[PDB]
PDB file of C-alpha atoms and ligand atoms in Angstrom:
ATOM      1  CA  UNK H   1     138.340 128.769 166.191  1.00 10.16           C
ATOM      2  CA  UNK H   2     140.357 126.573 168.222  1.00 11.84           C
ATOM      3  CA  UNK H   3     144.272 127.200 167.670  1.00 13.55           C
ATOM      4  CA  UNK H   4     146.030 124.809 165.054  1.00 12.83           C
ATOM      5  CA  UNK H   5     149.185 126.188 164.696  1.00 16.32           C
ATOM      6  CA  UNK H   6     152.354 123.674 165.653  1.00 17.43           C
ATOM      7  CA  UNK H   7     154.114 124.618 168.731  1.00 17.41           C
ATOM      8  CA  UNK H   8     156.745 122.530 169.902  1.00 17.20           C
ATOM      9  CA  UNK H   9     157.467 123.722 172.901  1.00 21.47           C
ATOM     10  CA  UNK H  10     159.487 123.978 175.766  1.00 24.66           C
ATOM     11  CA  UNK H  11     159.644 119.916 175.703  1.00 24.16           C
ATOM     12  CA  UNK H  12     159.976 119.594 172.104  1.00 24.62           C
ATOM     13  CA  UNK H  13     156.214 117.740 171.488  1.00 24.57           C
ATOM     14  CA  UNK H  14     155.730 115.808 167.930  1.00 25.02           C
ATOM     15  CA  UNK H  15     153.411 113.348 166.551  1.00 24.84           C
ATOM     16  CA  UNK H  16     154.337 109.722 165.146  1.00 24.89           C
ATOM     17  CA  UNK H  17     152.221 107.672 163.658  1.00 24.89           C
ATOM     18  CA  UNK H  18     152.097 103.698 163.358  1.00 25.18           C
ATOM     19  CA  UNK H  19     150.920 101.932 160.202  1.00 23.84           C
ATOM     20  CA  UNK H  20     148.186  99.220 161.190  1.00 24.78           C
ATOM     21  CA  UNK H  21     144.730  98.310 156.091  1.00 24.73           C
ATOM     22  CA  UNK H  22     142.642  99.715 158.891  1.00 26.30           C
ATOM     23  CA  UNK H  23     145.263 102.811 160.062  1.00 29.33           C
ATOM     24  CA  UNK H  24     147.555 104.466 157.655  1.00 30.36           C
ATOM     25  CA  UNK H  25     149.426 108.000 157.813  1.00 28.12           C
ATOM     26  CA  UNK H  26     150.969 110.085 154.830  1.00 27.62           C
ATOM     27  CA  UNK H  27     153.846 112.168 155.861  1.00 25.96           C
ATOM     28  CA  UNK H  28     153.808 113.976 152.770  1.00 24.32           C
ATOM     29  CA  UNK H  29     150.258 115.251 153.070  1.00 25.92           C
ATOM     30  CA  UNK H  30     150.342 115.032 156.759  1.00 26.27           C
ATOM     31  CA  UNK H  31     147.056 113.096 157.117  1.00 31.48           C
ATOM     32  CA  UNK H  32     145.782 109.938 158.604  1.00 30.75           C
ATOM     33  CA  UNK H  33     143.637 107.569 156.650  1.00 26.50           C
ATOM     34  CA  UNK H  34     141.406 104.936 158.702  1.00 27.84           C
ATOM     35  CA  UNK H  35     138.457 102.776 159.353  1.00 29.64           C
ATOM     36  CA  UNK H  36     135.088 103.206 161.586  1.00 33.15           C
ATOM     37  CA  UNK H  37     135.908 102.706 164.863  1.00 32.97           C
ATOM     38  CA  UNK H  38     139.320 100.989 164.556  1.00 33.34           C
ATOM     39  CA  UNK H  39     142.510 101.561 166.597  1.00 35.81           C
ATOM     40  CA  UNK H  40     144.387 104.609 165.320  1.00 36.34           C
ATOM     41  CA  UNK H  41     147.848 104.674 167.020  1.00 36.02           C
ATOM     42  CA  UNK H  42     148.964 108.385 167.594  1.00 35.76           C
ATOM     43  CA  UNK H  43     152.582 108.425 168.980  1.00 34.02           C
ATOM     44  CA  UNK H  44     153.515 111.508 171.363  1.00 32.33           C
ATOM     45  CA  UNK H  45     157.157 112.275 171.118  1.00 34.33           C
ATOM     46  CA  UNK H  46     159.051 114.592 173.648  1.00 33.50           C
ATOM     47  CA  UNK H  47     162.830 115.964 173.903  1.00 30.99           C
ATOM     48  CA  UNK H  48     162.262 116.367 177.952  1.00 29.83           C
ATOM     49  CA  UNK H  49     159.661 114.666 180.128  1.00 29.35           C
ATOM     50  CA  UNK H  50     156.646 116.854 181.182  1.00 27.64           C
ATOM     51  CA  UNK H  51     155.965 117.022 184.621  1.00 27.78           C
ATOM     52  CA  UNK H  52     153.247 116.326 187.190  1.00 27.38           C
ATOM     53  CA  UNK H  53     149.710 116.939 185.812  1.00 25.52           C
ATOM     54  CA  UNK H  54     150.392 117.271 182.181  1.00 24.76           C
ATOM     55  CA  UNK H  55     147.412 116.458 180.211  1.00 23.00           C
ATOM     56  CA  UNK H  56     146.498 115.390 176.447  1.00 22.19           C
ATOM     57  CA  UNK H  57     143.375 116.673 174.588  1.00 21.99           C
ATOM     58  CA  UNK H  58     142.361 115.719 171.381  1.00 21.13           C
ATOM     59  CA  UNK H  59     139.449 117.897 169.328  1.00 24.82           C
ATOM     60  CA  UNK H  60     138.543 117.504 165.770  1.00 22.05           C
ATOM     61  CA  UNK H  61     137.706 120.627 163.661  1.00 19.22           C
ATOM     62  CA  UNK H  62     136.500 121.236 159.976  1.00 18.62           C
ATOM     63  CA  UNK H  63     140.030 121.940 157.816  1.00 18.36           C
ATOM     64  CA  UNK H  64     137.319 124.143 155.470  1.00 17.89           C
ATOM     65  CA  UNK H  65     137.667 127.794 156.454  1.00 18.54           C
ATOM     66  CA  UNK H  66     133.649 127.905 155.079  1.00 21.73           C
ATOM     67  CA  UNK H  67     132.824 125.569 158.136  1.00 19.62           C
ATOM     68  CA  UNK H  68     135.657 126.156 160.423  1.00 16.99           C
ATOM     69  CA  UNK H  69     133.237 127.634 163.402  1.00 15.52           C
ATOM     70  CA  UNK H  70     131.036 124.533 163.219  1.00 13.98           C
ATOM     71  CA  UNK H  71     131.240 121.801 165.816  1.00 12.63           C
ATOM     72  CA  UNK H  72     132.581 118.407 164.762  1.00 14.05           C
ATOM     73  CA  UNK H  73     130.658 116.016 165.815  1.00 16.66           C
ATOM     74  CA  UNK H  74     128.861 111.984 164.586  1.00 18.79           C
ATOM     75  CA  UNK H  75     125.899 112.468 162.525  1.00 17.18           C
ATOM     76  CA  UNK H  76     122.543 111.533 164.034  1.00 16.35           C
ATOM     77  CA  UNK H  77     122.487 108.115 162.685  1.00 19.05           C
ATOM     78  CA  UNK H  78     126.038 107.105 164.122  1.00 18.42           C
ATOM     79  CA  UNK H  79     125.083 108.932 167.343  1.00 20.79           C
ATOM     80  CA  UNK H  80     121.715 106.319 167.759  1.00 21.50           C
ATOM     81  CA  UNK H  81     124.100 103.290 166.792  1.00 22.47           C
ATOM     82  CA  UNK H  82     128.915 104.046 178.476  1.00 22.79           C
ATOM     83  CA  UNK H  83     131.918 106.074 178.679  1.00 26.37           C
ATOM     84  CA  UNK H  84     132.054 108.304 175.588  1.00 26.28           C
ATOM     85  CA  UNK H  85     129.169 110.454 175.136  1.00 24.39           C
ATOM     86  CA  UNK H  86     127.384 109.373 171.850  1.00 24.54           C
ATOM     87  CA  UNK H  87     127.793 112.602 170.016  1.00 23.70           C
ATOM     88  CA  UNK H  88     131.818 112.227 170.332  1.00 24.72           C
ATOM     89  CA  UNK H  89     133.528 112.026 167.026  1.00 29.23           C
ATOM     90  CA  UNK H  90     136.627 110.927 169.086  1.00 28.50           C
ATOM     91  CA  UNK H  91     137.374 108.316 171.439  1.00 27.58           C
ATOM     92  CA  UNK H  92     140.368 106.669 173.407  1.00 28.41           C
ATOM     93  CA  UNK H  93     140.438 103.022 173.795  1.00 29.46           C
ATOM     94  CA  UNK H  94     142.593 100.968 176.512  1.00 32.45           C
ATOM     95  CA  UNK H  95     142.974 103.424 178.659  1.00 30.72           C
ATOM     96  CA  UNK H  96     141.427 103.609 182.373  1.00 30.96           C
ATOM     97  CA  UNK H  97     141.466 107.831 182.515  1.00 29.79           C
ATOM     98  CA  UNK H  98     139.654 109.344 179.552  1.00 30.25           C
ATOM     99  CA  UNK H  99     137.982 112.188 180.158  1.00 32.20           C
ATOM    100  CA  UNK H 100     135.222 113.508 177.507  1.00 29.54           C
ATOM    101  CA  UNK H 101     134.640 116.898 177.784  1.00 30.50           C
ATOM    102  CA  UNK H 102     132.371 119.762 176.232  1.00 27.31           C
ATOM    103  CA  UNK H 103     133.066 123.521 175.881  1.00 27.44           C
ATOM    104  CA  UNK H 104     130.428 125.554 177.680  1.00 29.86           C
ATOM    105  CA  UNK H 105     130.479 128.200 175.583  1.00 29.57           C
ATOM    106  CA  UNK H 106     131.577 126.846 172.184  1.00 31.30           C
ATOM    107  CA  UNK H 107     130.146 123.382 172.467  1.00 31.65           C
ATOM    108  CA  UNK H 108     133.125 121.420 171.035  1.00 30.69           C
ATOM    109  CA  UNK H 109     133.972 118.200 172.125  1.00 30.37           C
ATOM    110  CA  UNK H 110     137.458 117.242 173.374  1.00 32.89           C
ATOM    111  CA  UNK H 111     138.785 113.618 174.642  1.00 33.89           C
ATOM    112  CA  UNK H 112     141.501 113.986 177.591  1.00 34.28           C
ATOM    113  CA  UNK H 113     144.167 111.739 179.276  1.00 32.14           C
ATOM    114  CA  UNK H 114     146.722 112.087 181.250  1.00 31.93           C
ATOM    115  CA  UNK H 115     150.162 112.373 179.956  1.00 32.76           C
ATOM    116  CA  UNK H 116     152.474 109.266 180.737  1.00 31.39           C
ATOM    117  CA  UNK H 117     155.894 108.500 179.627  1.00 28.67           C
ATOM    118  CA  UNK H 118     156.960 105.723 176.938  1.00 27.44           C
ATOM    119  CA  UNK H 119     156.551 102.595 178.008  1.00 29.62           C
ATOM    120  CA  UNK H 120     159.644  99.925 178.742  1.00 28.26           C
ATOM    121  CA  UNK H 121     161.504  99.489 174.887  1.00 27.27           C
ATOM    122  CA  UNK H 122     159.498 102.825 173.637  1.00 25.89           C
ATOM    123  CA  UNK H 123     160.826 106.098 172.864  1.00 26.42           C
ATOM    124  CA  UNK H 124     157.169 107.291 172.310  1.00 25.97           C
ATOM    125  CA  UNK H 125     154.073 107.535 174.097  1.00 25.79           C
ATOM    126  CA  UNK H 126     151.184 105.987 172.103  1.00 25.09           C
ATOM    127  CA  UNK H 127     147.776 107.039 172.502  1.00 22.68           C
ATOM    128  CA  UNK H 128     144.742 104.785 170.727  1.00 20.50           C
ATOM    129  CA  UNK H 129     141.851 106.901 169.195  1.00 17.65           C
ATOM    130  CA  UNK H 130     139.135 105.717 167.375  1.00 14.49           C
ATOM    131  CA  UNK H 131     136.670 107.515 165.167  1.00 18.87           C
ATOM    132  CA  UNK H 132     133.478 107.008 165.189  1.00 21.23           C
ATOM    133  CA  UNK H 133     131.634 108.454 162.201  1.00 20.71           C
ATOM    134  CA  UNK H 134     132.897 108.184 158.070  1.00 22.77           C
ATOM    135  CA  UNK H 135     134.182 111.437 156.612  1.00 22.45           C
ATOM    136  CA  UNK H 136     130.960 111.001 154.074  1.00 20.14           C
ATOM    137  CA  UNK H 137     128.222 110.695 156.736  1.00 19.14           C
ATOM    138  CA  UNK H 138     125.424 112.983 155.816  1.00 19.72           C
ATOM    139  CA  UNK H 139     124.193 114.999 158.928  1.00 18.37           C
ATOM    140  CA  UNK H 140     127.977 114.968 160.108  1.00 22.25           C
ATOM    141  CA  UNK H 141     131.053 115.609 158.314  1.00 20.73           C
ATOM    142  CA  UNK H 142     129.347 115.519 154.927  1.00 20.31           C
ATOM    143  CA  UNK H 143     132.645 115.012 153.302  1.00 18.54           C
ATOM    144  CA  UNK H 144     134.193 117.838 154.823  1.00 17.34           C
ATOM    145  CA  UNK H 145     137.577 117.412 155.499  1.00 17.97           C
ATOM    146  CA  UNK H 146     138.870 117.651 159.020  1.00 18.22           C
ATOM    147  CA  UNK H 147     142.057 117.837 161.600  1.00 17.52           C
ATOM    148  CA  UNK H 148     142.920 116.580 164.601  1.00 16.79           C
ATOM    149  CA  UNK H 149     144.633 118.747 166.949  1.00 18.59           C
ATOM    150  CA  UNK H 150     146.420 117.373 170.194  1.00 18.20           C
ATOM    151  CA  UNK H 151     147.130 119.273 172.268  1.00 22.17           C
ATOM    152  CA  UNK H 152     149.905 118.857 175.502  1.00 23.30           C
ATOM    153  CA  UNK H 153     148.429 121.501 178.386  1.00 23.38           C
ATOM    154  CA  UNK H 154     149.063 121.655 182.197  1.00 23.84           C
ATOM    155  CA  UNK H 155     146.358 120.683 184.998  1.00 22.99           C
ATOM    156  CA  UNK H 156     144.820 124.404 184.586  1.00 23.44           C
ATOM    157  CA  UNK H 157     144.961 124.006 180.551  1.00 24.44           C
ATOM    158  CA  UNK H 158     147.940 126.137 179.350  1.00 23.32           C
ATOM    159  CA  UNK H 159     149.241 125.303 176.563  1.00 21.78           C
ATOM    160  CA  UNK H 160     152.364 123.378 176.587  1.00 22.67           C
ATOM    161  CA  UNK H 161     152.798 122.270 172.960  1.00 21.93           C
ATOM    162  CA  UNK H 162     150.560 121.790 169.773  1.00 18.16           C
ATOM    163  CA  UNK H 163     150.389 119.488 166.579  1.00 19.39           C
ATOM    164  CA  UNK H 164     147.903 118.099 164.286  1.00 17.91           C
ATOM    165  CA  UNK H 165     146.911 116.249 161.112  1.00 18.78           C
ATOM    166  CA  UNK H 166     144.407 115.718 158.708  1.00 17.76           C
ATOM    167  CA  UNK H 167     141.989 112.671 159.351  1.00 15.92           C
ATOM    168  CA  UNK H 168     140.119 110.755 156.805  1.00 17.34           C
ATOM    169  CA  UNK H 169     137.861 108.085 158.235  1.00 18.31           C
ATOM    170  CA  UNK H 170     136.641 105.824 155.350  1.00 19.94           C
ATOM    171  CA  UNK H 171     136.352 101.776 154.180  1.00 19.08           C
ATOM    172  CA  UNK H 172     140.241 100.984 152.548  1.00 18.35           C
ATOM    173  CA  UNK H 173     142.468 103.821 153.980  1.00 18.42           C
ATOM    174  CA  UNK H 174     145.615 102.192 152.023  1.00 16.74           C
ATOM    175  CA  UNK H 175     143.582 102.578 148.556  1.00 14.44           C
ATOM    176  CA  UNK H 176     142.735 106.153 149.678  1.00 17.92           C
ATOM    177  CA  UNK H 177     145.941 106.677 150.629  1.00 13.54           C
ATOM    178  CA  UNK H 178     147.559 106.171 147.228  1.00 12.62           C
ATOM    179  CA  UNK H 179     144.785 107.596 145.471  1.00  9.22           C
ATOM    180  CA  UNK H 180     145.417 111.280 147.155  1.00 10.33           C
ATOM    181  CA  UNK H 181     149.512 110.554 147.004  1.00 11.47           C
ATOM    182  CA  UNK H 182     149.536 109.862 143.104  1.00 13.91           C
TER     183      UNK H 182
HETATM  184 ZN1   ZN U   1     127.971 108.662 160.836  1.00 17.30          ZN
END
């Protein structure tokens, strides 16, 4: 099982979220609610700047202990529907340097981009993720809750920082957020 323990590390790495309803985040639940294939802005916040060659990895895992060892991937239907391999749940949009990776021993998927510092006028770096299957899809997540783990890594894959958030991919994110909060 991939690690999910929060580790702010030497650079004081944490996550922030931009309300878009296509994407909305509940701090109380540490849970993002989003629509299929739509923009999910995830912000990287650091106290100090990580150095040359730093990478940002995203990986989905099942939250439930009974499915923890199972690989999260798209359902056959959504796989069937030229950068992201069709099996990958998580894509990155708006970035020319996206790497799609598959672990040789675990078969787990991840998507990696280089760390870039914040743009002018911003105090954070925003990455636009897309989730390519609904939480409810049979033969995929099948209503099993997932966690996205965001890892800051050096060029050799060593850990610099780790954060995570739950995700629900659904038709009406604002409504589902309200229900789970209340
Ligand atoms: Zn699906």
